[PDB]
Amino acid sequence: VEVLEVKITEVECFLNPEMGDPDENLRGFSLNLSAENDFSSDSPQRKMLPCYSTARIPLPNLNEDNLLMWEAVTVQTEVIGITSMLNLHAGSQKVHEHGGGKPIQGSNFHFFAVGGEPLEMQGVLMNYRSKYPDGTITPKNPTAQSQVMNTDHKAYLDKNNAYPVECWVPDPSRNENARYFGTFTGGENVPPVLHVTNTATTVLLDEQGVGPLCKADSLYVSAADICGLFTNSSGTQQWRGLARYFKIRLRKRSVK
Amino acid sequence: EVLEVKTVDAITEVECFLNPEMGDPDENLRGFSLNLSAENDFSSDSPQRKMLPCYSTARIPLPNLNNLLMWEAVTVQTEVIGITSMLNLHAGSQKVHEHGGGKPIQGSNFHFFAVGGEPLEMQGVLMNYRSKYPDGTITPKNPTAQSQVMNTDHKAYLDKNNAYPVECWVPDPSRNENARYFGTFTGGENVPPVLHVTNTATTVLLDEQGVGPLCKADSLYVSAADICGLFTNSSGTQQWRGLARYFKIRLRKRSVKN
Amino acid sequence: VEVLEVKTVDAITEVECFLNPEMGDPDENLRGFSLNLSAENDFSSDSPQRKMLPCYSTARIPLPNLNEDLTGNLLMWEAVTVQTEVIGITSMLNLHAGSQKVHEHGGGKPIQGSNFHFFAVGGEPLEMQGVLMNYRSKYPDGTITPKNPTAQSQVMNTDHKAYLDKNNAYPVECWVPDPSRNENARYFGTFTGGENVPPVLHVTNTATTVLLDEQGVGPLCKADSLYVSAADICGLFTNSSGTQQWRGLARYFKIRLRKRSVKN
Amino acid sequence: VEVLEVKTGVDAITEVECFLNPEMGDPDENLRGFSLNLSAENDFSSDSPQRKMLPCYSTARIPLPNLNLLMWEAVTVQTEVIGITSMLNLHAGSQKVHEHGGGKPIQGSNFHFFAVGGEPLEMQGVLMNYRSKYPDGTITPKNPTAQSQVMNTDHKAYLDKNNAYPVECWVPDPSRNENARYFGTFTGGENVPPVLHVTNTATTVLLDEQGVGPLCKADSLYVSAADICGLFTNSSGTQQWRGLARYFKIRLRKRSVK
Amino acid sequence: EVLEVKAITEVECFLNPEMGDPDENLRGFSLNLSAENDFSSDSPQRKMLPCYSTARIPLPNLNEDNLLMWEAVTVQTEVIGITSMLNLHAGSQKVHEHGGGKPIQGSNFHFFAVGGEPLEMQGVLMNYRSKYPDGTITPKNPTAQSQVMNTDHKAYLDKNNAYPVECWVPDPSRNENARYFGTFTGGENVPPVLHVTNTATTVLLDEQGVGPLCKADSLYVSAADICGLFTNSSGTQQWRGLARYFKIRLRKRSVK
Ligand SMILES: [Cl-]
Ligand SMILES: [Cl-]
Ligand SMILES: [Cl-]
Ligand SMILES: [Cl-]
Ligand SMILES: [Cl-]
């Protein structure tokens, strides 16, 4: 529909990570990782699989102000609790005899989105013959083509802690009413590098000065913040994730 | 000679996904190469077709037109699709140690794209001129020792998909007057892959004088190579892994003298 | 606080400060180091020694009172810019004392591994949010750590809010600056984790950070005080034996301030 | 050398292009672009490297159209390393990374350097070891002392012969080269990954603060390069330097001088 | 008071490194590093300690007859001989059987300054109980506090080859009349990364448009360029240093 003239409120929210949480005391961690399954019998357990975080954020009803819609203009966001990884005394395997614990390191994924509706996602699989567990939503009727680009695998990030990170990326051919940003760093011993500052703002307005338009007086925040692998004294490995903070500035926009 | 920009229906967007062409050794390993061999003498180097990753290319047809009118490519949005699929450490990859997770994809990688008004122009360079390339590949014809450095005979068009091996060919900086190309190669056993996705990033394709690629025959050419690293199997065999690349291109009608 | 016009002089002032690090100080001779790090404590049995936990540094700098009376425009000090650097980085080029040989007949092992470089400047104490690796850790007397933690303290638990109101008491491993508050401060930090991460530290008297927000307003010093805060964990020192210690260094601050008018 | 006005109108601009080959040592007719195997652990008192083990600076004089006063002025250069994807061949020659693995990538110490000047590059000599005995066909610092291992102002030369000046003996001289522009990056290490970019969208302006470029004496332009990509590890454990060609495209204009 | 800009001279100098020079032949190298000395008994040899380089450059007298001083406006600088490190055939331990020699690598420090008086140093020590050798100038009467900040340790860089790099840094609380720039990179395996170009200039003017002012007609250059460690065949290690070029553009400035 036709976007018209601008006619200014802040929302803030703290999205928890969904790393698998194998029992209550391991909130923020996945189950121990399995290794060396044949592509032809790869059946990962639910609690081993990090999933995308999402929340529907209700916004003030605009009935007392064609229509009006909230417009997202800017967001400030950071990963919460980065210094917790300076605890090298709890749970982690010694680097060597008499040494402290092994830092969280290895492959990591840091990702956020702000939109006027659920994030649109595309499925890609490492191994199309993976049997995903109950409580996950993964590409339906995958083929070999699902290990590169198969355009049947389209979804909405419409449920929290359901869509595994290894199965889904944001869809660049859609997401007209959202902005998203992500960096993947892969490797056995990659160091995590995380920055905090209250002086960083991201602008959400497009080439024509229009931010995401909030449908049904709601916005969707999305995140995945896999910080790396935690190595237990036994040699077992677990994903560790951290919460993400969002502060979103919005203004009223007339539409038709 | 390039004249005036034109100004209803003087703008068009086209979008597509290019699939990677890494070798596809069997019906279930689409997006991977055959296991890499090692330590072949220069005198007896005969790589199998399915071990060799190839440049991806496609020709996108644009609406016909008629001091000629041509479509001009102004901006591109591109990312690699499926970067999170590397967070599956449970399938096929060798354990990092006893009781450990699978080894992540890592090692030598190459990220490349191009947008042109005609096929990408390539220069051939070889690690080993005596390498014997298999049927189904197109490689520098009749190379010499000189072909291991610069040999100006090795000129080709990226004019066929899944045929031009990445290890044999580079974009030619002495040509490609009607195209824009971007590439980064990172070599090493342990190189971490580092990949960014956002729908807010745009490359401008216009040159110093405000002209983008002009599409001959109302056709646009997209080119890619996205080798993400090596997958290490439980046995210790390694394979290339690749991913698809998204393109969105904004074009505009431009007038040209005959 | 409704903000009005910048005054112009006798309108401008500069304060400077050297903040020492609080790495734990295990004995009289090892100022700037932690106790030997322990390893492999079960989450159900994790009681770290006071001297093993580096803490945030903080200092309160007194400023000149500006108001003849408070009876309906106040003057306040506004922080505009800061120069800051880590003091003594070249001390890590001592490879002859205490550090394990890299191999037979080799130099000592450089300081390396996980590090955290953090600073802030505010018109009030830094506001902090608690997050724990392990909510079952038993923290020692003389530290201030998240009260009544649950499993949610391993992710985000909005109950863990604190003021950095005391030097050498808030452990770096329990607390981050709170991006949901600190309306009247500016903070900057980088965490780099890994067993063999190289330290990369720059010194120059030519670098300035601007503390003004989008509206051109800097931190406003309530009660004629400026709060500086730092954490500079440089990495891990590996002794002959194989035991490791955090090493930390002091941070310089030079802050320029101007007189700003406010309503009330 | 008094500089006056930039000349104007038709035929006031020219454009030269050059593919400069690397000079890595070429130990036999088939190993064009490599060095001889690296020796190791020679005492400083008895260090006598074989010529084919020593990479040298590349250079060429490019002759320009005769003008006579007018001189050609170099204003821009586009430059690129050629064949960077050739390092994705891990099947030929190189030591396997482990049992059943691919070949070991080229990695380690690397040097990427180019220059554009209106006369030969001016160079300063600096030795790791002043007692090194250099072989026939190489040009190295004369009568070096222990001071040659730091700064000896005696060691001035012109880059006036291709494949003669060893890269280990010479650096561009920042106290001279008023009539040239040089750019280099040294990365040292046993395992450093090579990182190389290609794009036809990057230009270096060669104009100084006053807006003056290299003025081309005796209607000559001097290009210079060193592109040591890293070390190739043969399956026996021997190592060789691997070099690549460098492309130049230089835009020039006529400048008035008295 | 700093008055008006009155014309122009250029000074140049190549400042040698001071790495320890253990014998006549090993100019530009330290003595083999010792390891594992107790804090309570750490007595390093003179020839093992790299020191700061400095030189006072004499300028033309201005006020033979508002007074005039020389103002330093720009500097071009680079490290000289970076390519010498491509000699892997001399002295260095092989990387493996039949392999080339081990490149120089590990901890490095690259620093320069330009002032109109001597560089002002602050003392900080790894180990305050270190006993420093004759021929060096180090913090007087140090305490534990000398391992962090101890304001007693102030000194002018007044003597070439005397102030050990490991004991001193530029003082950011002082040096109103100099500009300094330095990077430390620590670690066993750190690669040296060095750039050369005759097209890079550092501007030395401050916020108010004023460069360093040469107090009594002299300009002071300071440097330390520790490139990393050379590993001999035996396994022993020595610092390697390189000279630094400076070209400094100066202009006449009126003062009170
Ligand atoms: Cl699906
Ligand atoms: Cl050909
Ligand atoms: Cl609390
Ligand atoms: Cl000479
Ligand atoms: Cl002192």
Residue numbers in the entry:
A (entry chain BBB): 32 to 38, 44 to 101, 106 to 296
B (entry chain AAA): 33 to 39, 41 to 99, 106 to 297
C (entry chain CCC): 32 to 39, 41 to 103, 105 to 297
D (entry chain EEE): 32 to 99, 107 to 296
E (entry chain DDD): 33 to 38, 43 to 101, 106 to 296
The article reads:
BK polyomavirus (BKPyV) is a small, non-enveloped, double-stranded DNA virus with an icosahedral capsid formed by 72 capsomers, where a capsomer is an association of a pentamer of the VP1 protein linked internally to a single copy of either the VP2 or the VP3 proteins. BK polyomavirus (BKPyV) is an opportunistic pathogen that uses the b-series gangliosides GD1b and GT1b as entry receptors. Viruses sampled sequentially from these patients accumulated multiple mutations in the BC loop region of the VP1 protein, which is involved in the direct interaction of the virus with sialic acids. All variant VP1 pentamer structures were globally similar to the WT VP1 pentamer with a doughnut-shaped ring composed of a central pore surrounded by five VP1 monomers in 5-fold symmetry.
The structure of the N-Q variant VP1 pentamer was also solved at 2.01 Å. Although no major change was observed in the backbone orientation of the BC loop that carried the K69N and E82Q mutations, the mutation from lysine to asparagine at position 69 modified the sialic acid binding pocket of the VP1 pentamer. Lysine 69 is involved directly with the double sialic acid part of the b-series gangliosides by making van der Waals, salt bridge, and hydrogen bond interactions through its side chain, and its replacement by asparagine leads to loss of those interactions. On the other hand, the K69N mutation in the K69N-E82Q variant leads to a steric clash that precludes sialic acid binding. Here also with the double mutant VP1, N-Q, in sharp contrast to the other four VP1 proteins, binding was not detected to any sialylated or non-sialylated glycans included in the screening arrays. Also consistent with the glycan array results, N-Q VLPs did not bind any of the tested gangliosides. However, the N-Q variant maintained its ability to infect 293TT cells after sialic acid removal, indicating that its infection occurs in a sialic acid-independent manner. Thus, another receptor must be involved to support N-Q variant infection in 293TT cells. Finally, as predicted, no infection was seen in any supplementation condition for the N-Q variant, confirming that gangliosides are not used by this variant for infectious entry. The N-Q variant lost binding to sialylated glycans, but it retained some infectivity, suggesting that in certain conditions, BKPyV may interact directly with the unknown receptor for entry.
